[PDB]
Amino acid sequence: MIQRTPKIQVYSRHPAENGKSNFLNCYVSGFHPCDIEVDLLKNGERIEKVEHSDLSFSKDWSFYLLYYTEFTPTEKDEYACRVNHVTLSQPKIVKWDRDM
Amino acid sequence: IQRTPKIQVYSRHPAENGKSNFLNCYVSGFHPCDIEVDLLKNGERIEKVEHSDLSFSKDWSFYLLYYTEFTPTEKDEYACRVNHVTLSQPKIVKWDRDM
Ligand SMILES: Cc1ccc2c(c1)sc(-c1ccc(N(C)C)cc1)[n+]2C
Ligand SMILES: Cc1ccc2c(c1)sc(-c1ccc(N(C)C)cc1)[n+]2C
Ligand SMILES: Cc1ccc2c(c1)sc(-c1ccc(N(C)C)cc1)[n+]2C
């Protein structure tokens, strides 16, 4: 079927509290074809030790996938998600918007 | 960097004609990820199948399982049809009852 471009959402598991351990998630949804690269970024730099869900799909072959890592937020630190996919020219970055 | 799937077909318990079992097609070790899988009662594509999710290694080798509840009979015969890029022609694999 026809190509389609991922929806990308970045969120913490519990609400932020500086210096308290949390998890950071990057949820990539709705996309096709399946092949995709995902990386999480502490101040523009690629976190080593990340974990991920399996890659699941609908009857209509939309794919869904989750990346996450334990982390401790601080006032100075800035976190984001870098996705590359065919439907993206340029690897797309999306910031973690704290204030929600 | 391409890799062709390993394909294994097996029942969960040993065959017993007219007793309910599960049939699995396990497709392993493959890349890239895109792949079609179907199970076949006498060459015909079974409607109501289930599947695991698609998991992968650090290596980006992918792993996936299809299965269905079924009742085997002496004359019935079952198989798995996989299509992948690395295959010229969709590959079929039989279920050997005497696994
Ligand atoms: C079925 C299910 C289970 C969990 C679950 C969802 C759906 S959807 C979701 C979630 C998605 C996005 C966000 N942010 C972008 C703030 C926060 C939470 N969770 C955590
Ligand atoms: C319409 C439709 C069909 C299937 C389907 C969805 C939507 S959304 C989804 C899904 C699967 C796994 C995950 N995580 C790994 C947490 C999150 C979402 N599935 C499996
Ligand atoms: C009755 C009977 C006899 C042999 C037999 C089975 C049932 S089920 C089975 C088997 C084959 C492959 C796998 N994996 C690759 C996960 C798991 C189990 N064997 C080898």
Side-chain angles (χ1 to χ4, degrees):
Chain A
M1 55 177 56
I2 177 198
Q3 283 195 349
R4 19 165 125 82
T5 177
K7 179 170 178 192
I8 301 148
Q9 318 170 78
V10 184
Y11 58 97
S12 70
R13 158 181 307 180
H14 313 297
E17 212 197 75
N18 292 287
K20 162 98 208 298
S21 178
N22 213 317
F23 291 79
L24 186 65
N25 308 276
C26 192
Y27 183 43
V28 190
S29 38
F31 62 91
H32 189 101
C34 106
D35 263 298
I36 190 159
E37 301 257 1
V38 184
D39 288 312
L40 308 140
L41 305 176
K42 185 170 194 186
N43 302 303
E45 242 194 29
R46 189 219 153 235
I47 292 158
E48 278 167 33
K49 229 288 165 199
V50 308
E51 348 213 79
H52 60 78
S53 79
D54 295 343
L55 187 67
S56 46
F57 54 97
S58 53
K59 286 166 214 305
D60 78 281
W61 306 92
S62 315
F63 291 92
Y64 308 83
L65 180 76
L66 187 67
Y67 269 82
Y68 60 97
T69 198
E70 179 136 65
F71 83 124
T72 305
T74 81
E75 322 180 342
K76 296 200 174 125
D77 276 307
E78 194 198 3
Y79 293 95
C81 191
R82 189 181 62 214
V83 196
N84 195 37
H85 193 224
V86 342
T87 62
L88 313 184
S89 51
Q90 286 287 289
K92 191 184 226 297
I93 290 189
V94 70
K95 303 190 220 288
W96 180 45
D97 175 26
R98 243 110 126 42
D99 38 280
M100 284 302 297
Chain B
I1 176 197
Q2 287 199 5
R3 292 180 263 278
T4 175
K6 180 170 179 194
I7 301 147
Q8 319 154 254
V9 185
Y10 57 94
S11 66
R12 162 179 305 178
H13 313 298
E16 206 67 90
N17 286 309
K19 297 156 188 232
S20 66
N21 214 319
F22 290 81
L23 185 67
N24 310 271
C25 192
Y26 183 44
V27 192
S28 38
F30 64 89
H31 189 103
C33 106
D34 285 274
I35 191 159
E36 280 176 56
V37 184
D38 287 311
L39 310 141
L40 303 177
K41 185 169 194 185
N42 303 304
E44 247 187 28
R45 189 218 153 238
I46 309 224
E47 304 262 293
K48 195 46 161 202
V49 308
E50 316 269 350
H51 59 83
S52 79
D53 293 343
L54 186 88
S55 50
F56 54 98
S57 53
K58 28 220 167 320
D59 207 357
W60 305 92
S61 315
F62 291 92
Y63 307 82
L64 181 75
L65 184 68
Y66 271 81
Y67 62 99
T68 198
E69 179 136 67
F70 81 122
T71 306
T73 82
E74 245 183 338
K75 198 261 242 86
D76 276 306
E77 120 251 49
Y78 294 86
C80 189
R81 188 181 61 214
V82 195
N83 193 37
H84 193 226
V85 7
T86 60
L87 310 187
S88 49
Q89 291 298 275
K91 191 189 170 120
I92 305 254
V93 271
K94 342 81 41 45
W95 181 44
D96 176 25
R97 282 208 186 51
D98 316 313
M99 51 234 152

